Design a protein around this ligand. Structure first.
Ligand SMILES: C[C@@H](Oc1cc(-c2cnn(C3CCNCC3)c2)cnc1N)c1c(Cl)ccc(F)c1Cl
Length: 285
């Protein structure tokens, strides 16, 4: 059985809490390689399934993501409730995030011409940055920080954003998101904590653009050449200067010139304190 190392000692498949299949009930689909369901164990859960028709490498990938998520302990990273691996199809059981993924939420919750404010966006940003800081200080590199991989606890004002998907980190541990990647990453395949800083800047743009695809109207190859030549995205519509400034710092060409997540968090905090930032109106389509 596969071994995993994080924050120190090794984890084993046996360390995962196996939940008896009889205890698990699927309620509804929630929408990649495999399905996701709302489920009950009563404890309400999200159930990630492995296709019975998969390769042996698929099997290990699935097991590896369970190990990875199960070893984190932070409020801004989605909890793993357990697994059901001794029956087919195999399940990973996650904390149910009723708000859904962040990209869909932003697109569905955009201010209507007939609600959401700057402070709400800043709190999402802060939530994920806190998650990233935790990963950084535990020397884990996510490799794919993006709005599609973040989840929300609920739609309303009490929402908490968390990092939810670790498929890219899992793959590399043993289709590329080049629009989220720094030059040294897509050119050299070099990944560090500063890799995630760059990607967080792109996530910030996603958040304050309210769910636009990065580098609108550009293809992957065009972005590659654009970014390699020093090109950077313009501010999202109505974006406050202090927020754009965080983005452009995250996108410094040299990794050593980019902020670590402690610094990012401080600057996000300073933004939430600035009335000229949070009183700024979001654009309405
Ligand atoms: C694996 C899957 O897990 C969940 C999906 C969801 C989810 C997706 N969509 N929805 C909708 C349910 C109906 N109301 C709107 C959100 C909830 C909630 N919690 C999860 N743990 C998931 C998905 Cl599908 C997308 C991004 C992620 F980062 C993750 Cl981790």
């Amino acid at each position: 059985n596969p071994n995993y190392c994080f924050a120190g000692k090794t984890s084993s498949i046996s360390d995962l809490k196996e939940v008896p299949r009889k205890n698990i009930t699927l309620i509804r689909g929630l929408g990649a390689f495999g399905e996701v369901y709302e489920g009950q164990v009563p404890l309400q859960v999200a159930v990630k399934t492995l296709p019975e028709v998969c390769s042996e490498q698929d099997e290990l990938d699935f097991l590896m993501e369970a190990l990875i998520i199960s070893k984190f302990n932070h409020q801004n990273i989605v909890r793993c409730i357990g697994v059901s691996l001794q029956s087919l199809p195999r399940f990973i059981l996650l904390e149910l995030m009723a708000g859904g993924d962040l990209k869909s939420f932003l697109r569905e919750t955009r201010p209507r011409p007939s609600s959401l404010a700057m402070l709400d966006l800043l709190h999402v940003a802060r939530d994920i940055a806190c998650g990233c800081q935790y990963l950084e200080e535990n020397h884990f590199i996510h490799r794919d920080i993006a709005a599609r991989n973040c989840l929300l606890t609920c739609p309303g004002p009490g929402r908490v954003a968390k990092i939810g998907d670790f498929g890219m980190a899992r793959d590399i541990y043993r289709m590329l998101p080049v629009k989220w990647m720094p030059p040294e990453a897509f050119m050299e395949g070099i990944f560090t904590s500063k890799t995630d800083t760059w990607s967080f800047g792109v996530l910030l743009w996603e958040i304050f653009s309210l769910g636009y695809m990065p580098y609108p109207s550009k293809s992957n190859q065009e972005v590659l050449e654009f970014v390699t030549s020093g090109g950077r995205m313009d501010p999202p519509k109505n974006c406050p200067g202090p927020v754009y400034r965080i983005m452009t710092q995250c996108w410094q060409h040299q990794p050593e010139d980019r902020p670590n997540f402690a610094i990012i968090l401080e600057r996000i905090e300073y933004c939430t304190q600035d009335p000229d930032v949070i009183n700024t109106a979001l654009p309405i389509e």
